[PDB]
Each structure stands twice: as C-alpha cells, then as structure tokens.
Ligand binder design. Structure first.
Ligand SMILES: [Mg+2]
Ligand SMILES: [Mg+2]
Ligand SMILES: [Mg+2]
Ligand SMILES: [Mg+2]
Ligand SMILES: [Mg+2]
Ligand code: NA
Ligand code: NA
Lengths: 308, 308
C-alpha cells in the first residue's frame, strides 16, 4: 500500500477545527485536502474522519479520529481490504488530569469556595471538611488507557491506588487489582471510586443502589466512562440519602443533562459537560497517530490501533 | 530538663478542636491536660498554644501551633529561660495539593463548569481553552518547605518546574533555580507563577505592574504566601487589561477580603479564604511535632523549629 493523498473529512469539525488539523498534517509527505461530502476515493487514498461513510471503502485506509468506531461497519471494512484505525489510547492525560482535579476539588473544597465567590462571601469551611489526597484510597474501575491515566496521576499525588479489571492481572502503580466479581470488595474502603471502563453489555448498570450501599458514606463516585455504567436514579437516591457524600460526573444517561435533573443541585456533585478529554491540542494528538502510521506503511510495519 | 506535664491553651481552639488535639497527644509519655486562659505553670511544664501569654513564662517550653511567630515577644522568652518553637515545615502537603488543584482547575476549566452548574447550563468551553498541565511551565517563587510541596506535585503531574530562591542552589524536582534578581527571567515563560515565600522587607510588593507586564498574557498568578507580596491594585489592573489571564488567591492585603473588591468578580480568579493549609488532621500534624521535641528534650538534642 502506497499513500498518495490524505483526505480530511468534514466530520472532524465535530471534534476540532479542520483547518488547524490540516496545518498539523502539513508535514506528512503527502497532499492533505479538505474532503466534501460528494467525494469518490481511489487507491492511494487515506481518509481521516470522525464518522462513517460508504464512499470510504474505495480508499486504501481510514483513520477514525475517535477512540470509538461503533459508527463503523468492521465486517464491510474487512470485505473491501480497507484498513481501519482509531484514536484509542491518546486520552489518558486529559482524563487523568480532569479526575485528579475533581479529587483535589473535593479534598481542598475548591467548589464550595467557588460558590462563595459568587456571593462575595468569606465562608470558612468546618474543621472536618478539608483533607488531603495523600494516603487516601482510590478505586479505578477499568484499567485500559483511560484508567491508567487516572492511576498515574493518583499515584503521583501519593494516593493508595486499587482497581478493577477483567483479567485481574497487575498494572503499574496499582497496589491491588480485583476481578469484576470482587467489585464490592474493591470499592468498600475507597475515598473515591472512578469509573473508566467501556460501556458494554457486561458493564451497563454495574453501579447501582447496592454499590452505593457498599461504598463509604464519605466517598465520592467519579464517572468518566459513560452515563449508563451507573443507574442514574439510584445515584440520585444514594446522594439524597447520604449513602455516598458526592460525585463528579462528566457523562450522563441523556446528554445534554436535562435542566430538571436533580444532579445539578447537589453542592457535592460536580457536573461537567462531557469534556474530561477536551484538549486545545486534540489536532496534534490525532495528527501524531496519522504520522506514525504513514511512516509505518512506508517501511511495511503493521499499523498502531488497527481494527481491521 | 525533665518534663512533668503538658498543657493546651484555650485559643488553640481558634485553629482546631482541643479535644481532638488532646486525643492525639495521648501516647506521649507525660500527662496531658487542658489549660484555662489564666493558669500558672511550674518547672517541668509544657504549654501548646496559638498566641502569646505571660502566665506561660513560668513554664519550661512553649510550642506555637502556627507556622508564624510574628505575634510572639521574642526577647522576653530569652529572659525567663522559656523555650519557643513553631509549626513550620508541616504545610507542604496541604498547600501543594491546593496549588495543584488551582492549576488543574484552570487547565481543565472546572471553575467555569461549576459556574454553569449554578445555571443548569451545558456550556462547552471553546476549543482553544482546555489544556493539560503535563509539559507546561510553573515557576515557584520561594523554595522552602511550602514551595517544595508545590514543586513535588507539579513535577509528579509532569510539569516543567523552575523556581526562585536566595542561594540559587539546586532543589529537588526543579529544572532551573534562579536568584531573586532574575525574577523576570524566571516568570517570563511560566504558565503559572506561584508565590510561596515569607513576607519580609525584601519580598513585600515584589510582584507588581512590571512583573505582570513581563508575565505571559495566558499565565496565571497563584498566591499562597501573603497578600502584600503582591501589590493588589496592580493585580486588579493587570487582570482588567489582560496583562495576565487569571489568578488563584488564598491571601489578600486585607482579610477578610472586603465585599467590594473587584477580585471577586473575575471569572478566571479563584478566591479562597486563607485555607490552602486547612486540614481536618491539623491536630495530628502538630501532635507529631510535640512528640518529636519532648523526646529531643529528654536526650539533650537540639529542638526542631526552635526560635528562642
Ligand atoms: Mg496471564
Ligand atoms: Mg452489582
Ligand atoms: Mg441551583
Ligand atoms: Mg520589580
Ligand atoms: Mg459578583
Ligand atoms: Na454507602
Ligand atoms: Na503580561
């Protein structure tokens, strides 16, 4: 396979400035050009796109600019001899910093301070409220690249780190890995429980009223996975009842989070709008994978993040 | 000198529950007991206190529960042969985590998301706004115990760390140490400038309109030193002008920060109420010190944090 051209599908606009992404791909070796919705693709063509189009199967190579290609018919890709790659594995830094910020927010009480700032109010916290992350336990549920991002920053801040993954196999910076059938054991002693798994059949609704009952009443839940990993009504009830102290939520069962949701009005909930992975450099991070795989097509090495 | 007894001034209450403090002193070797705001103290008497009291000069040993000493008559403790210590060196964890939280707040935009939560509003940041700390420069001004706590967490989160101190000698986790006369050089390329120096003659007003001019316009000031290290009206002007982007301020020229201060109303300022060192275990931290120093009195070693 010899790559003549790189096409930037207009669908990348849903995650970044297409113009800025073309700039970041301008040192590739190959013409890069903004593709319309009316484009045929010959051999020699690489497409970079957000979502799927059927026209792409006449190209040599498609790179999905997302981690997730549930938009993309994997069988039909195999059929055409069209290579498919994705952008899995570049979100550990943004997401792990978001999560460390959530945790430091709760520990140091930044969110209450910000509420007070609205009201020009010098309100001192109660003695019992401020704590430090150093020595506290975090449980990270899911230990692929997202969770490892959380783990590394939690360990950097001196946290005791445990987690949950399917294999039960050790992971750098995690003291104890549990299998998913010991979820309750893993979360029982954690100050924070962080959700960082893909949404599957197996993970949908895994965090519900019984998990909130096992969790410590001073503990907080972080969701940076998908909304339906959590049973959202049970979260509301667990918050109302004091089964857990609070939550930081980046994802929800319906997004945008409807205005009438009770989740907005808990003091110890942080709502963020599906931005835990937002970065002003997303274009450079995707462009670096594109570049890596161009240089890999030219030496004959296999592609990073190959689906089919 | 043979220590019979430990007493606890009533106005340690102004920083911690003295009951919790007595618990944490109950593995000492020597009887522990609460003091009234008039008590007399013989030979073998140890007092722990917030502020100064003259009835305590009849005791052997006073431990200030603050980092500061400036509200103590340093001379007169000489005369009666009364040892004086403070609580310097125990704030690097709390303050370092508060600063990491400030920086993660600006980089991930949590403060703007929290303002949106008040309004039940799904407000995505602009593409250009969210960034990561990994790879960005922080300059820590003052590399004593406070600054080192900032340094270690910023280095662990992958930041490029430089700093300023008098000697200019190496400090662990700092790439470049500058002397105070190269302050402008030190802050010119920093995304965050962090103030962690004592207020002295030399440091009063060291950050003012010329320093805000030299600083990058996307940079933020953090102040966890004292308000008057900064010329507050020049900070306001620098914020109004866009000389810098924002600030996180824990300390002010007048505390409580008056209601009419314009610092409350900048979006990219975080006000916090002199709480960057708040911890619900402050009692355990000061307790630790007390125990170190009575064991040092009994084997004739020199006292930790001794002024007089
Ligand atoms: Mg194995
Ligand atoms: Mg269950
Ligand atoms: Mg409301
Ligand atoms: Mg100057
Ligand atoms: Mg206002
Ligand atoms: Na619970
Ligand atoms: Na400036």
């Amino acid at each position: 396979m010899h790559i003549e051209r790189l096409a930037v599908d207009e669908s990348v606009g849903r995650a970044m400035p297409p113009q800025r992404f073309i700039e970041a791909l301008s040192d590739l070796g190959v013409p890069v050009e903004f593709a319309g919705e009316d484009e045929q693709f010959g051999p020699g063509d690489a497409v970079a796109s957000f979502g799927h189009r059927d026209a792409f199967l006449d190209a040599d190579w498609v790179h999905c600019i997302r981690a997730g290609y549930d938009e993309f018919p994997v069988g039909v890709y195999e059929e055409a001899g069209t290579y498919l790659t994705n952008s899995t594995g570049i979100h550990g830094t943004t997401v792990g910093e978001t999560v460390a910020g959530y945790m430091l927010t709760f520990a140091r009480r930044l969110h209450a301070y910000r509420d007070a700032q609205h009201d020009h109010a010098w309100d001192l916290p109660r003695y019992e409220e401020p704590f430090t992350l150093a020595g506290e336990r975090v449980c990270v549920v899911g230990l692929g690249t997202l969770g490892r991002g959380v783990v590394d920053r939690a360990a950097a801040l001196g946290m005791e780190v445990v987690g949950v993954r399917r294999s039960g196999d050790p992971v750098d910076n995690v003291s104890t890995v549990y299998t998913p059938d010991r979820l309750h054991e893993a979360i029982a002693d954690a100050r924070f429980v962080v959700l960082a798994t893909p949404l599957t059949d197996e993970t949908e609704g895994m965090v519900a009223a019984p998990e909130f009952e096992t969790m410590r009443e001073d503990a907080s839940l972080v969701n940076v996975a998908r909304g339906p990993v959590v049973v959202e009504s049970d979260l509301v009830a667990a918050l109302d009842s004091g089964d857990i102290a609070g939550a930081a939520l980046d994802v929800f069962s319906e997004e945008p989070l409807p205005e009438d949701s009770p989740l907005w009005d808990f003091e110890d909930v942080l709502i963020t709008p599906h931005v835990s992975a937002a970065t002003s450099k997303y274009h450079e991070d995707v462009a670096a994978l594109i570049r890596e795989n161009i240089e890999k097509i030219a030496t004959g090495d296999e592609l990073t993040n190959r689906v089919v």
